[PDB]
Design a protein around this ligand. Structure first.
Ligand SMILES: O=C(Nc1ccccc1NS(=O)(=O)c1ccc(F)cc1)[C@@H](O)c1cccnc1
Ligand SMILES: O=C(Nc1ccccc1NS(=O)(=O)c1ccc(F)cc1)[C@@H](O)c1cccnc1
Ligand SMILES: [Cl-]
Ligand SMILES: [Cl-]
Lengths: 304, 304
């Protein structure tokens, strides 16, 4: 028993973290095979960030201007290119620590682990969710750009996120490993604001299932509801609309607990309408939405 | 910016996780040099756990009865011994992945990362605090015993905890790496209950400092207080008594924010006496105490 915001073991990703320097800008890069992936704003100074024309800026740069360092050893850059908002530095040595990997573009509501890095060195690992507004609520400082988000399927690392920027509002924006930003964000020093941060309803429900599995069932009531009625309540509280796909995905949790999804929805509806009244669920005084139904099942079954 | 319950990168500890089987009991072991450390209840069946005489139980066991497996390779056990509540299995091969390590017995209130494991395979990593009642609020299932807690100082892993048991109340008990349990817990299937779970006041204060650093200062008031007056309030709310040592340890945080410790204490006093009134601090609706002043400083400065 017990329920924690649990990140994947980060060792396979630590083996890929390198330091990339271009001019006076130092950030993190991901070394997989003979390619180092990093944010393209490595070629900019804080002056260039106001309005950067990256194609023109990249042209004033050559292979020898990109300093890649894996630990204390210097990598030889034999090629460079811009794929959307990431630079791909071809090095002459394949990473001996490259794990089985994939680049996947995750959907909003899905979760992933972040290995926060500075100067190509890992400092910490935490669990995150891609918000419905395509931002993440991470912990990133200056020098953290190039820190990656990932998932692990037994021995295959699915790289899903690369850190690029913090918005003036304190939330984080970044790209997938092909350089495409999640959301409408651009890698420019300009006024950019995130949309409404809605709550991932299916995840809150999965976490109510985890709470019940873990002995916390004070919030369970004698009522039920319908998808349309529950969604009328969800809409008002800025919660994501719950679909039949979400009900289906909650099936394994519903089966293990013996609680129908619409019954759990009625409990959620009363928690929204009445609050927690000073009580906690899984040691939390608010409704947690950064655990997918897959995360709950994995944690409550010991998936290694 | 951003503030997360951030665990240490777990790679150095993944390289040490092995599977230990004795009879039909399978748990995790820590392989450092030519020694595998694991909980001694590996020699018990669920029948023995009612009242185990471990010396007598260990005597009916020989080196060949301890099956150690590092990944898919079998380790040869050439010696075995009982140190308090841990078995130390001498193997014929030193772990090539042994990092610089120490065994440290942490103090209540201090934090550490746990690499939860099943069958010698890591499944997740999360941050924890040793509660003032010597329990931990972890996420551990059957098969997780032998999962370790650690801290990292640049390249040295300080192993501080080994998981042994879950109490009937859902919290977790375990030992340091010398086999000594934290608290009054014994490795026996008997009625054991934890004491009062008090709140780590210095950690709540460090987290209020992190909140302020990260732009959240709604809770900051025009009042101050004294150590004795603040402690009168802390006592009633089952908060740990705040000492001058705690004030000193909060010095670096107090200096960076320009907020005196006793001023932060007065804000804490009003948060205890009045509640959060539906507001959040660092996305949390309760006072977080699982971040030491060192954790806040490290996270807010990027210690790798
Ligand atoms: O976004 C950051 N800073 C920042 C905050 C707010 C406005 C502007 C900047 N920096 S900037 O204009 O140079 C820039 C813009 C877009 C981009 F993709 C990278 C850099 C960046 O230094 C950072 C720090 C902390 C955690 N993550 C990222
Ligand atoms: O403590 C556990 N189970 C349990 C729960 C409650 C009462 C008894 C037992 N198990 S027992 O009597 O066999 C035992 C007792 C002491 C001990 F150190 C190891 C095993 C153990 O299987 C476990 C599971 C889940 C997460 N951590 C540990
Ligand atoms: Cl820059
Ligand atoms: Cl057992």
């Amino acid at each position: 028993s017990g329920f924690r915001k649990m990140a994947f073991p980060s060792g396979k990703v630590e083996g890929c973290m390198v330091q990339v320097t271009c001019g006076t800008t130092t950030l993190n890069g991901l070394w997989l095979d003979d390619v180092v992936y990093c944010p393209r704003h490595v070629i900019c100074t804080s002056e260039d960030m106001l309005n950067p024309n990256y194609e023109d800026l990249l042209i004033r740069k050559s292979n020898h201007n990109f300093l890649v360092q894996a630990g204390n050893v210097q990598l030889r850059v034999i090629g460079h290119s811009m794929q959307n908002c990431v630079l791909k530095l071809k090095v002459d040595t394949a990473n001996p620590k490259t794990p089985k990997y994939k680049f996947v573009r995750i959907q909003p509501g899905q979760t992933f682990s972040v290995l926060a890095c500075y100067n190509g060195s890992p400092s910490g690992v935490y669990q995150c969710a891609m918000r419905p507004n395509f931002t993440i609520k991470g912990s990133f400082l200056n020098g953290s750009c190039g820190s990656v988000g990932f998932n692990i399927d037994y021995d295959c690392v699915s790289f899903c996120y690369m850190h690029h920027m913090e918005l003036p509002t304190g939330v984080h924006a970044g790209t997938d490993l092909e350089g495409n930003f999640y959301g409408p964000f651009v890698d420019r020093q300009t006024a950019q604001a995130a949309g409404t941060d809605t709550t991932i309803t299916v995840n809150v429900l999965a976490w109510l299932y985890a709470a019940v599995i873990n002995g916390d069932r004070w919030f369970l009531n004698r009522f039920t509801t319908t998808l349309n009625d529950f969604n009328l309540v969800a809409m008002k509280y800025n919660y994501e609309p719950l679909t039949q796909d979400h009900v289906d995905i909650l099936g394994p949790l519903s089966a293990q607990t013996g609680i129908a999804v619409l019954d759990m929805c009625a409990s959620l509806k009363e928690l929204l309408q009445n609050g927690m009244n000073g009580r906690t669920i899984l040691g939390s005084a608010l409704l947690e939405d950064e655990f997918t139904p897959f995360d709950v099942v994995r944690q409550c079954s010991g998936v290694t």
